[PDB]
Structures are given as structure tokens and as C-alpha cells.
From a paper:
Higher plants have evolved a family of SO42− transporters, SULTRs, that mediate absorption of SO42− from the soil and its distribution to the entire organism. AtSULTR4;1 forms a homodimer and has a structural fold typical of the SLC26 family of anion transporters. We visualize the structure of AtSULTR4;1 with bound SO42− and demonstrate that AtSULTR4;1 is an H+/SO42− symporter. We show that H+ transport is likely mediated by a glutamate residue (Glu347) highly conserved among the plant SULTR family and that the cytosolic STAS domain modulates the transport process.
We determined the structure of AtSULTR4;1 at pH 6.0 in the presence of SO42− by cryo-electron microscopy (cryo-EM) to an overall resolution of 2.8 Å. The final model consists of residues 70–644. The STAS domains are swapped between the neighboring subunits. The SO42− is located between the N-termini of TM3 and TM10, and is coordinated by side-chain and backbone atoms entirely from the core domain. Sidechain hydroxyls of Tyr116 and Ser392 are within hydrogen bond distance to SO42−; and so are backbone amides of Ala153, Phe391, and Ser392. A conserved Arg393 from TM10 is ~5 Å away and although it does not make direct contact with the SO42−, it likely provides the positive electrostatic potential for the binding pocket. The helix dipoles of TM3 and TM10 are oriented with their positive ends pointing to the bound SO42−, providing the positive electrostatic potential to the bound SO42−. A negatively charged residue, Glu347 on TM8, is ~7 Å away from the bound SO42−. In the current structure of AtSULTR4;1, both the bound SO42− and the putative proton sensing site Glu347 are solvent accessible only from the intracellular side, and thus the current structure is in an inward-facing conformation. However, in our structure, the N-terminus (residues 1–69) is not resolved and we do not observe densities at the corresponding position on the STAS domain. Although most of the dimer interface is contributed by the interactions between the two STAS domains, the domain-swapped arrangement in dimerization leads to the interaction of each STAS domain with the core and gate domains of the neighboring subunit.
Residue numbers in the entry:
A (entry chain B), B (entry chain A): 70 to 644
The structure:
């Protein structure tokens, strides 16, 4: 194994190091990295506050994994760090375990990051990511919208100024807000409302214009730069600051709370599922847009390695960001260096900007989180689903409502269960076509023509428009037994009639068959002999023919009933 | 609603009452009922002993539900009562809950029967039985074989003569047997071995001959008639008798142990799943053999009603029997009256034969259970799978080994999970064909001919041989993006080359498309415009065309790129 291949195998970053056009790529990467870091620092602190951890642990979650991802990540525009959904899930798990320790929370979050990284590395090495991508996008969209509403209603407590009941359901949150309304304060609410209005106005102006689009990245910072100013001029009494923030880079430390690890598998999987469904999707979309190759397994392995190293350096789970990756995308980011620069910015903060961070009001961070999650309430997809596919709209509405009123875990379980139910329903109801004229197709909808001869009395030609395996064998057995039922009805009448003498199976679209398929075929052949019906096979696939010959069906039904076309099969059936 | 329709709707039994040919049907039904009752009484007591309940509760489980099933059951040959697998599952649940109460066991079993009946009625009314039939037959066969081995190794303790450790795993059972080998007794082992040998010889002789086939039904009784005789002549000291058995029909009593009901849902579902997979399968096979209609939903409703009434009359869950239903089948049973007569026989025992039952040795019942489950070790299917389908053989072996060494619940979970994994793998990897000549098909395997013109430079014709929905949309997106990757590779070379200008989709086999399909199609069209590739739709289905028009794809890509055939599409692409 030479170095040129071994290095590329272990370090995917070199995939863009060798093909690096310095002149334009360096300037574009530097600008994109600076922009993403500026957008990220306040967002990192706000998301850390959302998860229940002290704000500094957001910056850690952006420092070490980013440097790791830029070395082990396949995507060249994806931005790695805290996100709203993963922070919400981490907060959910920690609150379900620890109440007010403020010290077990940190260790639990770091252990959760380590478990998520290990699960991601396992699912990337084994290439088991396809086991999750069966979940419909409507379910994910509804769950994300409900999570966004829950996040906003949880963060409104900083605007109100009094602590509210901590829960993931809307009803207890609203009940607590109503109960505590007697402790309302005007200064924090006014500050939060003004900051949120300014942030949303800046974001809308940036998205409306094509050239003045950097405001989206400068919106989270500017609000703080605004809010702190009022905190340093008028000094409102009822506002709260983030307090002292430790200064310095995080140090190496193995997790010490493995005793709760078994409690964290249900969350560690869930977060990992998000990375399979959202982060990998963002990476693939960006790769398709930017004309480079990407695979869903190496990306998961890179995310897992980044999470593992972040856990080793006091970080909580970090995945791809819908907002930051986009902002990187229109910043003309070319390689993964834009990540490294971003990380460097974080490091600079951890060395120089922490003393100035203690004057940031908490309502400003709450407003930043609210602005970030306002774009996650994705009702446009709900309208689109209502217009196009009402089954998908029903799935979206059910998932959103259940996640809103019941827990996050209940909503996730309902969404996954409904997706599995619909997958099983589709697998268990294959399309079966009753063919008419020999070079023809389904008579019910496709072709109604009569080229002087369309169907033959006594012969039924059936095509199974799918591979036959254990999931759909029962439906096929029932459909083929309908002809026996028709024969029984004919023989049970008061007059002698029999219009089913031969049944021909078109197995040309049948890609493959398993043992259940040949067993059922033998059973139906025996039942047809009981009913005096002849079974024929028309267009066996090579693999299908080999399986049929191995199972002994050819000897049971006779070699003379196996053909290569429908024309000769029907011709010998008439004779 | 007239009586002729209402009565038939509520009471399916009348389906065979109206069409009843007295002369032959009465004699055949009477003989079949007597035969099944004779085979059932000892089997009922033996299975009740297997479940951990006192033997009499087997007879109850054959008395009231049978009379109910004959009124509410759709099958005319199915025999309802205790079975080996359901008894094993009931014993597993009870031992997991109650250790040696011998009184909470009865109430727990009756409550389990009520819960099973309610779940079956719910799944029959809602017609949700298709949610379970995706499980492969190999998984069920392996689980049943492992359960049979576990049942035999649990029942060998009566042969040994000393109590062994109660578990559902082979290793603790063998360890306990080795530990207790110092308490071995010769009389019970000799009695059990002789009874088992006689039973197996009788069963083999009955199955070998065509006319002397009643011995299979007389084997369980004869052994008792044998064993008791030695218990009444030589009186061995170390043998154990079933003891006093209460006399009389069971009385009405609602369950009183609802407090454990939530613990019993995981078992109540599992047993119900068995009824969906095994009992309904037996009913459908018998109906197909005997030339009458049967549906999988009314049968589940009848089983649920029978279970509910049995629970109301002190019975534990009862489903269809592989052995007794067969014995009914070659006994020329025609209607459901054969069930009623069988039940009557049970009633006679409960009125007259209970005093004579106290002399039955326990080793005789153990031998009966061992003989009953010896036929459930279904290695013939394992050999068949090894010969035909090695994936199914691997599933069978994994399920059997895990159920043998680990718990029943772990084996069930592994089997269901592997079946789901394979269903998802099949759904997520649809077949996509690269067509050659216009009235042609897949070029890789199907057709290699060259009718003077087969493929065109610059044009790729792709057919998706499946409906497009949320499960397989990712694979289709990747397959369609492979052409973009090829274009990128062509443009990244040292020479100017571009051999992908048009991509045509054959959507004739695409039965239907959902919202995810049209969203992905729009995304791929936009990416093709980025790569300067034209997207065309060749054979849209009527529903597919309607969905495409509703989603706005026709306006986005242009109406001029929608056709009805591949010939004209390629003709306009060349021009
Ligand atoms: C450490 C091992 C390093 C590499 C091993 C995996 C390489 C190929 C794996 C592969 O084909 O993908 C999977 C099979 O691999 C497995 O799923 C095997 C593990 C079973 C998990 C039990 C739970 C199947 O995925 P697919 O190949 O994408 O189809
Ligand atoms: C009491 C109601 C009596 C009859 C109601 C059901 C009649 C038709 C039902 C039907 O179409 O079958 C099912 C839909 O019905 C449901 O699944 C609805 C219930 C949702 C369950 C949530 C868990 C679907 O089964 P399918 O029709 O066979 O396809
Ligand atoms: C849609 C979102 C996509 C999710 C990806 C799928 C990943 C699979 C992992 C699912 C984990 C579910 C979590 C928790 C539940 O098992 C229970 N704790 C339910 O708790 P209880 O219900 O009792 O409160
Ligand atoms: C084993 C695991 C499989 C699924 C696990 C939980 C399933 C929960 C969903 C079942 C609810 C009932 C019906 C819906 O699925 C629709 N398919 C109704 O059928 P339709 O309208 O589509 O005919
Ligand atoms: C193959 C057989 C077919 C089965 C039909 C499917 C029915 C679905 C119901 C599955 C119930 C599974 C039972 C128990 C498990 O959930 C846990 N108690 C595992 O316990 P633990 O693993 O911790 O011991
Ligand atoms: C969500 C629920 C879905 C399944 C739940 C548990 C799944 C357990 C099975 C996964 C084990 C790994 C691989 C096997 O499935 C094979 N398909 C290997 O792939 P192959 O050889 O077929 O390519």
C-alpha cells in the first residue's frame, strides 16, 4: 500500500487538497469561513443555552469537531456545529435524566456525543444507512415543524422573564406561562421583541436582495451587538446576563459517566437517525449542486469521527446545519478549508472574546434561537402536500400534531411506525395485470383496443409486475386463487360451465423469486390440478428459471409448459 | 335489514347450515368430531400441564371456545383448542410474572386469553392482519423448531423424575439437568420412554398406511390407557399422578387480575401474531383444499370472539391446531358441526370422565407433549432452503439458534427485525433498466440483439420498473444522478467530450407516484439544466400524469417534452 493511496483512503480532505486552485479558492474559502464563523459564534452560544448547558459548551461543540470534520468529512460546503433539533433532543434527554445538577448535564451531554459518534461510525462502516432512509419526507417535515414550535415556546420564557415549567409538550408549557403571568417583566420582553424584529427584518432583506445577502450571517451577531449596548447604557434591572464564561481551549478528558450510558442509547440512536436523514441529505444536495462526488457512508463515518473527537474534547453532539451550510453555499465556498477557518475563528473567541461575552443578555440569545427556528416551521410543504398528495398531507399533520401535543419520542415513534406501515402496505399489494392480446398489457386501464382478437375464452394471462418474495407472496396467492373461486362458483351453479382451463403467468417483469415463491407456485399448481386447471410459465428470467429448476418445479409441472413468449404459450393452449 | 341477511352477517355458521346434505355430511361430521375429541382430550390435558396450569384448565380451553367458534368461525375444518406453541408462550409469560402461586397463574392465563381475544377482534374488525404477514416463512419455521426443542427439553423433567430449573433457554435447562442427575429415577423414565416409543410407532404406522390412519388420533389416548394400567398393576413408587381433578362445567366469572394487564400486552400481541400467521394460514389452506370461500378478517374476528367467551368461562388462549385440523381434514369433515360434536365430547368428560383422570401418570402427559412437538422440528424446510435459497436458510438458522440459546422474545424480535430489514432492502433497491432499441427492454441481460440500430449516442433511456414513492426515491435519485457524475467526469478530462444530452424516463411500469416522486423529479430536472441535460417523460400513466400536472412539473419542464411512446421521444431528441 503506497502513501498516495493510503493517505487518500484515511484522509478524504486531500481529495480537495491536490486539486486546489489557490488564486480564487483561497479568497473564497477565507470569506466563507469568516462569514460562517461570525454567524456561528452567537448561534453556538444560543443553541448551547437551548440544550440546558452553559453557553461556553456551544463554542467547544464548534471548535474541535470542525477541525476534525475538515480532515475526515466528504462534503466541501457542509458546516458542522450545534443545530436547533439536536440541541432540543439533547435537552430532552438530559431533562429526562438530570433535573438541576448543572454538572451531570455536562458529562451526560459529552457521553451522548461519544455514543452518537460511535453509532455513526458503526453505521458508516457497515453501510447500514439505508435502513433509515425509508422514512417519508412528510414525516420528517412535520416532526421538524412541531419541534420548531416547541423550541420557540420553550425560549419565550426568557422574553417573559420568569421560569416556566420545563416540558416538551405544548399544554404544560402554556399552562405554566398562564400560571406565571403574574411575574411578567417589561424590560426583557421589550428587548427580546426588538431584537427578534431586527433579526427577522435583516434576514428578510438579505433573502430578498441578491447582492445584499450577507445580512443573514450578520443578523445573529448584530442583535447581540445591539442588545449589549442597551445593557451597557440604560442597565435595565430585570434583564439577565449570561454571567462569567470560562476562558481557554477545552482540555482532553475521557467521559466519566458511563453508568448512564444504557439510558442514552434511545437518544443516541435518534440523534444518529437525524444525521442519516438530514445532514447526509444536505451533503448530497450540496455535492450534486457543486459538481463533485459524495457517498452517504464516508460522510457518516466522518461525522462519527468528528463527534468522537469532540466528546474527547468536551463537546456535545454536532451535525450539519441547514442555515450555516446554505450560508457557506452562497458564500462561494469551494473546499473544506472554509470549515477550518471557521474553526479558527471559534478558537480566537475561546482565547480572546470570552471576557466580553459576559455582558450578553439572555433574552438576546433567546431571540436568536427564535429567529433561527422560525424558518423551520415549514408550512409551505404542508400546503404543497395538500395540493398534491393528501396521504402525505395526512402523515404530515398527524406527525406534527402528535409531536406537538405528546412527547418528541411519541411523535418519532408514530412517524416511524406510519412510514413502516405504508412501506409494508406497498410491498404487500403488488400490481398484477390481466393481459389481453399477446403483445399487449393490462386490459383494465392501459389498452382497450381490439385488433380483431383481444382475449380468449378459457385462458387467463396474468403478469406479476414485481419480484416475488416473502412479503408479497400472500397477495399473489390470493389473486391466483380468485380463479379457483370463480371455477368453484361456476361448478356450483345450476348449469354446466367452466371458463378457466389454462392460467399463464408472465414472469418477464419478475426480477427474482425466493423459496416462498416456488413453494407457493407448487401449491397453486397442485390446487389447479385439483380444479382441473393447467399452469404455465411464459417468460422466466434466467435467475428465475434457475431457481425454478432448483426447486424441482419444472419436473413437477412438466417441461412442456415452460416457454419463452406468450404467443406460443397461448397457441399451444388453444390446441 | 331482513333476517336472512342479518343472521348470515352475525352468524357465519349458517353459511354451512343452509347448504347441508344430511345423509353424508352428518355421518362424516359425527365421525370427525368423535375422532378429534378423542385426540384432543389427552392433548388438552397435556398442553395445560405444559403451560403450568393444572390439567383441567386444558379441557375448559376446549369446551366453551369450541362451541363459540363453531358459531362464529369461518373455517369448516379448523380445530380450536390448546396448541403447543401458545401453551409455551403462556407458560413463558406466567413464569416471568408469577413463580409458584398456582392461583395467580390461572387468573393471569384467563386475562391473557381475554386480551388476546380483544386484540384479535380489533385486528379483524380493522382488517389490519396484513401488517404481520410480511414475516417470512423461514423465520416462523425456525422459531417453531426452536420452540419445539425447548418444549421437549422442558418436558423431559417428568421423564427424569426430579424438578429442573425453569427457563426458556437450552443452556440453563441442560445445566440444571446435569446438576440434578443425582436424583434420577428409573420407573418414570422407563414409563415415559415406552409410552413415547409406542406413540411414535403408532403415528408412523398411521401416516405410512392410507386406510389405517386413525391411529394418529388414537395414539395420545392409547398411551394413557397403557400407562394408567401399569400404574394400577405394579404401582411404581417414584411415578407421579395428576391428582384430584375438579368435576363439572366451568362457571361464568369475569377476570379479577386486571392490575397485571399492562404487563401482558407484549405476550397478548405475540400470541395474536401467531393466530394471524399460523391459524389463519391453516384456515385458508383448508378452504382452498375444500372448495369454499374464506377471508382472513372474519376468521380473526371469530377467533377473537371465541377467545373472549372462553376467558369469560375460565379458559386460556386457544388457536388453530396443525395436528387436529389435519386429522379433521382426512376424517372427511365437511361443516363446522364436527367442532360442536368435539366440544360435546369435552363436555362429557367434564361431566363423567374427570374422576377417572386422577390415575393418569404425569410422565404419560409429558410423553404425549414430546410426541406432539417431535413433528414440529421442521428440518425438512431447512434442507429445502439450503438447496434453493441460502438467504432464507441463513434467516432460518439465525432465528432457530437465537431462539434456542436466547429467550423466545429475543428470537421473535430478531426474526421480525430481519424480516423488516429485508423488506426495507427490497423496497429501497428498485430495478432500473437502461433500454436499447425503442421497442426493447433491459440491455444488460434481457436483449443483446442489434436490429441494425440498438443504442444512440448522447441519449439514455431509463425505465423505472416499479412505482415511485418515499421508500425508493433515494435510490432512484442516485441512479439518475450517476449520469450527472458521468458528465462531470467527462468535463473534468483533458479533452472536450459530452455524451449525455437527453435523458428519457419510461414511466409505463410506474403504477403511481407520490409527492416525493414529483419533488425529486423537479430537483433532477433542475440539476440537469445545470448540467445542460434535457429531461423527458415518455409513457406517463394516467394517475402519474395527473399527479405530475398537479405538482406543476409540466409547466416547469415544458409540455413539449411529454409524449406517449419512446419512438417519437427519441425521434424528436435526435432532431
Ligand atoms: C467493520 C467492518 C469493516 C467493513 C465491513 C462491512 C463492509 C461491507 C458491509 C456491507 O456489505 O454492508 C451491509 C452488510 O453488512 C452487515 O450488515 C454486516 C453486519 C450485520 C449487522 C448486525 C446487526 C449491507 O449494506 P449494503 O452493502 O449497502 O447493501
Ligand atoms: C370499528 C369499525 C368497524 C369497521 C371499521 C373498519 C372498516 C374498514 C377498515 C379498513 O379500511 O381497513 C384498514 C384501515 O382502517 C384503519 O386502519 C383505521 C384505524 C387506524 C388504526 C390506528 C392504530 C386498512 O386495511 P385494508 O382495507 O385491508 O387495506
Ligand atoms: C421522524 C424522525 C426520524 C427519526 C429517526 C429514527 C431513529 C430511530 C430511533 C428511535 C428512538 C425512539 C426513542 C424513544 C422511544 O423508544 C421510547 N423512549 C418511547 O418513550 P415513551 O413513548 O414511553 O415516552
Ligand atoms: C410491525 C410494524 C409495522 C407498523 C408498526 C405500527 C403501525 C401503525 C400504523 C397502523 C395504523 C392503521 C392503518 C394505516 O397503516 C393505514 N395503512 C390504513 O390503511 P390504508 O388506508 O393505507 O389502506
Ligand atoms: C416469528 C414469530 C412471529 C411473531 C409475530 C409478531 C408479533 C409482534 C409482537 C412482538 C412482541 C415481542 C415481545 C417482547 C419484547 O418486546 C420484549 N419483552 C423483549 O424482552 P427482552 O428482549 O428484554 O427479554
Ligand atoms: C427500523 C427497523 C428496520 C430493521 C430493524 C432491525 C434490523 C436488523 C437487521 C440489520 C442487520 C444488517 C444487515 C442485514 O439486514 C442484511 N440486509 C445485510 O444486507 P444485505 O446482505 O441484504 O445487503
Amino acid at each position: 500500500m503506497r502513501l498516495v493511496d493510503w493517505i487518500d483512503t484515511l484522509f478524504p480532505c486531500f481529495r480537495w487538497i491536490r486539486t486546489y486552485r489557490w488564486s480564487e479558492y483561497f479568497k473564497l474559502d477565507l470569506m466563507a469561513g469568516i462569514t460562517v464563523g461570525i454567524m456561528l459564534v452567537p448561534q453556538a452560544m444560543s443553541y448551547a443555552k437551548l440544550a440546558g448547558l452553559p453557553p461556553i459548551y456551544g463554542l467547544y461543540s464548534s471548535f474541535v469537531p470542525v477541525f476534525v470534520y475538515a480532515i475526515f468529512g466528504s462534503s466541501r460546503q457542509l458546516a458542522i456545529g450545534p443545530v436547533a433539533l439536536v440541541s432540543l433532543l439533547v435537552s430532552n434527554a438530559l431533562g429526562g435524566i438530570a433535573d438541576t445538577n448543572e454538572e451531570l448535564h455536562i458529562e451526560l451531554a459529552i457521553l451522548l456525543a461519544l455514543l452518537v459518534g460511535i453509532l455513526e461510525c458503526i453505521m458508516g462502516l457497515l453501510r447500514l444507512g439505508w435502513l433509515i432512509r425509508f422514512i417519508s419526507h412528510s414525516v420528517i417535515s412535520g416532526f421538524t415543524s412541531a419541534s420548531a414550535i416547541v423550541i420557540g415556546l420553550s425560549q419565550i420564557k426568557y422574553f417573559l422573564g420568569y421560569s416556566i415549567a420545563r416540558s416538551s409538550k405544548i399544554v404544560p408549557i402554556v399552562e405554566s406561562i398562564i400560571a406565571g403571568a403574574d411575574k411578567f417583566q417589561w424590560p426583557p420582553f421589550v428587548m427580546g421583541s426588538l431584537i427578534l424584529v431586527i433579526l427577522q427584518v435583516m434576514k428578510h432583506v438579505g433573502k430578498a436582495k441578491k447582492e445584499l445577502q450577507f445580512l443573514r450571517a450578520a443578523a445573529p451577531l448584530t442583535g447581540i451587538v445591539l442588545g449589549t449596548t442597551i445593557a451597557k447604557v440604560f442597565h435595565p434591572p430585570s434583564i439577565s446576563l449570561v454571567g462569567e464564561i470560562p476562558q481557554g481551549l477545552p482540555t482532553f478528558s475521557f467521559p466519566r459517566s458511563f453508568d448512564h450510558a444504557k439510558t442514552l442509547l434511545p437518544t443516541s440512536a435518534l440523534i444518529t437517525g437525524v444525521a442519516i436523514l438530514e445532514s447526509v441529505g444536505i451533503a448530497k444536495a450540496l455535492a450534486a449542486k457543486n459538481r463533485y462526488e459524495l457517498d452517504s457512508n464516508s460522510e457518516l463515518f466522518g461525522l462519527g469521527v468528528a463527534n468522537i473527537l469532540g466528546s474527547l474534547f468536551s463537546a456535545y453532539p454536532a451535525t450539519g446545519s441547514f442555515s450555516r451550510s446554505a450560508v457557506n453555499n452562497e458564500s462561494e465556498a469551494k473546499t473544506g478549508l472554509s470549515g477550518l477557518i471557521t474553526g479558527i475563528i471559534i478558537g480566537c473567541s475561546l482565547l480572546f472574546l470570552t471576557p466580553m461575552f459576559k455582558y450578553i443578555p439572555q433574552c438576546a440569545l433567546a431571540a436568536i434561537v427564535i429567529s433561527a427556528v422560525s424558518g423551520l416551521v415549514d408550512y409551505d410543504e404542508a400546503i404543497f402536500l395538500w395540493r398534491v398528495d393528501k396521504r402525505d398531507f395526512s402523515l404530515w399533520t398527524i406527525t406534527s400534531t402528535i409531536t406537538l401535543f405528546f412527547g418528541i419520542e411519541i411523535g418519532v415513534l408514530v412517524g416511524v411506525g406510519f412510514s413502516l406501515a405504508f412501506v409494508i402496505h406497498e410491498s404487500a399489494n403488488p400490481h398484477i395485470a390481466v393481459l389481453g392480446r399477446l403483445p399487449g398489457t393490462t386490459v383494465y386501464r392501459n389498452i382497450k383496443q381490439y385488433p380483431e382478437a383481444y382475449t380468449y375464452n378459457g385462458i387467463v394471462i396474468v403478469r406479476i409486475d414485481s419480484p416475488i418474495y416473502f412479503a408479497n407472496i400472500s397477495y399473489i396467492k390470493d389473486r391466483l386463487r380468485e380463479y379457483e373461486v370463480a371455477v368453484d362458483k361456476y361448478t356450483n351453479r345450476g348449469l354446466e360451465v367452466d371458463r378457466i382451463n389454462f392460467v399463464i403467468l408472465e414472469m418477464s417483469p419478475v426480477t427474482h423469486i425466493d423459496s416462498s415463491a416456488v413453494e407457493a407456485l407448487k401449491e397453486l399448481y397442485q390446487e389447479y390440478k385439483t380444479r382441473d386447471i393447467q399452469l404455465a410459465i411464459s417468460n422466466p428470467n434466467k435467475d428465475v428459471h434457475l431457481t425454478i429448476a432448483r426447486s424441482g418445479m419444472v419436473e413437477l409441472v412438466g417441461k412442456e409448459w415452460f416457454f419463452v413468449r406468450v404467443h406460443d404459450a397461448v397457441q399451444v393452449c388453444l390446441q
